[PDB]
Amino acid sequence: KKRKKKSYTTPKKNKHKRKKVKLAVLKYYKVDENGKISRLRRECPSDECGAGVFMASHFDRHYCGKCCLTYCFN
Amino acid sequence: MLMPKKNRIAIYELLFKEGVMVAKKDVHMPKHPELADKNVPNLHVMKAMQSLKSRGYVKEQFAWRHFYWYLTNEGIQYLRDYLHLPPEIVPATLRRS
Amino acid sequence: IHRIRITLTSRNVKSLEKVCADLIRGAKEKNLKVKGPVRMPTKTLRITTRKTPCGEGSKTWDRFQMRIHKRLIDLHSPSEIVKQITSISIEPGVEVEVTIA
Amino acid sequence: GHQQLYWSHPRKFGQGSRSCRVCSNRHGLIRKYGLNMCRQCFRQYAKDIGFIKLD
Amino acid sequence: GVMDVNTALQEVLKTALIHDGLARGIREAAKALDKRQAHLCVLASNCDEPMYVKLVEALCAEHQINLIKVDDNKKLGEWVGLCKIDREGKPRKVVGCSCVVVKDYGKESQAKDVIEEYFKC
């Protein structure tokens, strides 16, 4: 009988905290400064989601999680 | 723990309409023998019951893998003080005397 | 059909036999012909369990027995007679299953 | 998310699906005839259930 | 003793806080705004940024909601009460929202009526 000896790797880890900005500069912008503004995201034509569902952007496969929709040309 | 507050007010409505109850330890299951079909997830409801009866002011009694509870009038006063619902709404349990 | 069966099941012979005799007497008071009791082989519910809660000592086992006796009696009578003879303040343990078939 | 993990491969011999109905003991279960106890608990209550030492 | 916007606004905010809900985080607030599920929203701007003010005022005009300009939100934050847990605790509030019905669903009040009849005229 001995110990478990979970000691060789990772003696201490620091928590992963997201530097989420309180100001919507990276998230949304108007670039117009007017009452009527344009939106920098593609209109979703799917009717399995809501009418206010806006997707973000990555290098590909805009990862919504709920639907896993990826734009492909068939 | 890891308990929401809408589930908290739902379980407080359940305690107000129920009062005296018997419980069975069931957490990991998706289907309970006698406390399912409440349109609310079972795990959080049972942890809500755990909070109610282990906050440190209402005593418990566990044997034969079951929970029988003696809801003290201190609990009645606590619920009245927090949720501010007058006790003039008598519980429906006082029929068939 | 007027054929009715009564299954009396209990763990002891005394109460079961007394109930069977009383039921047969009540049926026989009426000018009714009734089939004699049939005795099932009394299936035995053996359970063997180690005596010691720990795993120490000589290997000793409790042999627990639960003996279930069951009897069937056949007769021909309408439902009212059966349900009037049933409510006779039966002694505890003699479970009754009355069937029409 | 939750449904992405649960119910992936059926556990058709789940040992943890049973426990002693009196003290919640994992070992020595008595499932015969539906007692579903650790054998110690059964010995504690065997005379009350109806099981008796005759032989 | 007095009747005004703040006196009942503190109570409505505290009731909204107590009955859980509340749009929290950067998401589910703008989404709730753009889905038009609610008919009220209280937003504050005490720092140096006019672009956000202009954007939310344009959105309020789009939703035909008249912006209410209140001074010294610290007055609300100190009159509403911030007892919270134990003897310490002072979490401020900047955003005021109330899902399903604007006043509340637990009580019936004429504060909603006077607010709406002041808004229409």
UniProtKB/Swiss-Prot annotation, chain A:
Domain of life (superkingdom): Eukaryota
Covalent cross-link Glycyl lysine isopeptide (Lys-Gly) (interchain with G-Cter in ubiquitin) as placed by the record, residue numbers: 30, 36
Outcome after substituting residue 30 to R: Abolished monoubiquitination by RNF25, leading to impaired ability to rescue stalled ribosomes
Modified residues (N6-acetyllysine): 27, 36
PTM info: Monoubiquitinated at Lys-30 and Lys-36 by RNF25 in response to ribosome collisions (ribosome stalling): ubiquitination promotes subsequent activation of RNF14, leading to EEF1A1 ubiquitination and degradation and rescue of stalled ribosomes. Deubiquitination at Lys-36 by USP16 is required for maturation of the 40S ribosomal complex.
Annotated coiled-coil segments of the chain: none
Result after altering residue 36 to R: Abolished monoubiquitination by RNF25, leading to impaired ability to rescue stalled ribosomes. Abolished deubiquitination by USP16, without affecting maturation of the 40S ribosomal complex
Region (Disordered), start-end ranges: 1-18
Zinc finger (C4-type): 44-67
Subcellular localization: Cytoplasm; Nucleus, Nucleolus
Assembly description: Part of the 40S ribosomal subunit. Part of the small subunit (SSU) processome, composed of more than 70 proteins and the RNA chaperone small nucleolar RNA (snoRNA) U3.
Name recorded for this polypeptide: Small ribosomal subunit protein eS31
Organism: Homo sapiens (Human)
Full-protein residues shown: 78 to 151 of 156
Curated annotation (Swiss-Prot), chain B:
Protein's cellular compartments: Cytoplasm; Nucleus, Nucleolus
Residues recorded as bearing Phosphotyrosine in the entry: 12
GO biological process: cytoplasmic translation; translation
Main localization (coarse): cytoplasm
GO cellular component: cytoplasm; cytosol; cytosolic ribosome; cytosolic small ribosomal subunit; focal adhesion; membrane; nucleolus; nucleoplasm
Top-level taxon: Eukaryota
Keywords for this protein: Cytoplasm, Diamond-Blackfan anemia, Isopeptide bond, Methylation, Nucleus, Phosphoprotein, Ribonucleoprotein, Ribosomal protein, Ubl conjugation
Gene Ontology MF terms in the entry: RNA binding; structural constituent of ribosome
Mod. after translation: Methylated by PRMT5. Methylation is necessary for its interaction with NPS1, its localization in the granular component (GC) region of the nucleolus, for the proper assembly of ribosomes, protein synthesis and optimal cell proliferation. Monoubiquitinated by ZNF598 when a ribosome has stalled during translation of poly(A) sequences, leading to preclude synthesis of a long poly-lysine tail and initiate the ribosome quality control (RQC) pathway to degrade the potentially detrimental aberrant nascent polypeptide. Deubiquitinated by OTUD3 and USP21, antagonizing ZNF598 activity. Deubiquitinated by OTUD1, antagonizing ZNF598 activity and stimulating formation of polysomes: deubiquitination by OTUD1 promotes stability and translation of a subset mRNAs with a high abundance of rare codons can limit the translation rate.
Source species: Homo sapiens
Section of the entire sequence shown: 1 to 97 of 165
Curated annotation (Swiss-Prot), chain C:
Recorded name of the encoding gene: RPS20
Description of how the protein assembles with itself and partners: Component of the 40S small ribosomal subunit.
Descriptive protein name: Small ribosomal subunit protein uS10
GO biological process: cytoplasmic translation; positive regulation of signal transduction by p53 class mediator; translation
One GO cellular component term noted in the UniProt record for this chain: nucleoplasm
PTM sites of type N6-acetyllysine: 18, 59
Record has Methyltransferase as a keyword: no
Listed GO MF terms: MDM2/MDM4 family protein binding; RNA binding; structural constituent of ribosome; ubiquitin ligase inhibitor activity
Entry annotated with the keyword Magnesium: no
Full-sequence portion shown in this chain: 17 to 117 of 119
Curated annotation (Swiss-Prot), chain E:
An individual GO BP term: positive regulation of canonical Wnt signaling pathway
Location (main, coarse): cytoplasm
Statement: the UniProt record of this protein carries the keyword Amino-acid biosynthesis: no
Alphabetized GO MF terms: RNA binding; structural constituent of ribosome
Coiled-coil portions: none
InterPro entries in alphabetical order: Ribosomal_eL30-like_sf, Ribosomal_eL8/eL30/eS12/Gad45, Ribosomal_eS12, Ribosomal_eS12_CS
Keywords of the record: Acetylation, Cytoplasm, Nucleus, Ribonucleoprotein, Ribosomal protein
A Pfam family recorded for this sequence: Ribosomal_L7Ae
Domain of life: Eukaryota
Residues with PTM N6-succinyllysine: 120
Subcellular location: Cytoplasm; Nucleus, Nucleolus
Gene Ontology cellular component annotations, sorted alphabetically: cytoplasm; cytosol; cytosolic ribosome; cytosolic small ribosomal subunit; Golgi apparatus; intracellular membrane-bounded organelle; membrane; nucleolus
PANTHER family named among the record's database cross-references: 40S RIBOSOMAL PROTEIN S12 (PTHR11843)
Family named by the database record: Belongs to the eukaryotic ribosomal protein eS12 family.
Role noted for this protein: Part of the small subunit (SSU) processome, first precursor of the small eukaryotic ribosomal subunit. During the assembly of the SSU processome in the nucleolus, many ribosome biogenesis factors, an RNA chaperone and ribosomal proteins associate with the nascent pre-rRNA and work in concert to generate RNA folding, modifications, rearrangements and cleavage as well as targeted degradation of pre-ribosomal RNA by the RNA exosome. Subunit of the 40S ribosomal complex.
Subunit structure and binding partners: Part of the small subunit (SSU) processome, composed of more than 70 proteins and the RNA chaperone small nucleolar RNA (snoRNA) U3. Subunit of the 40S ribosomal complex.
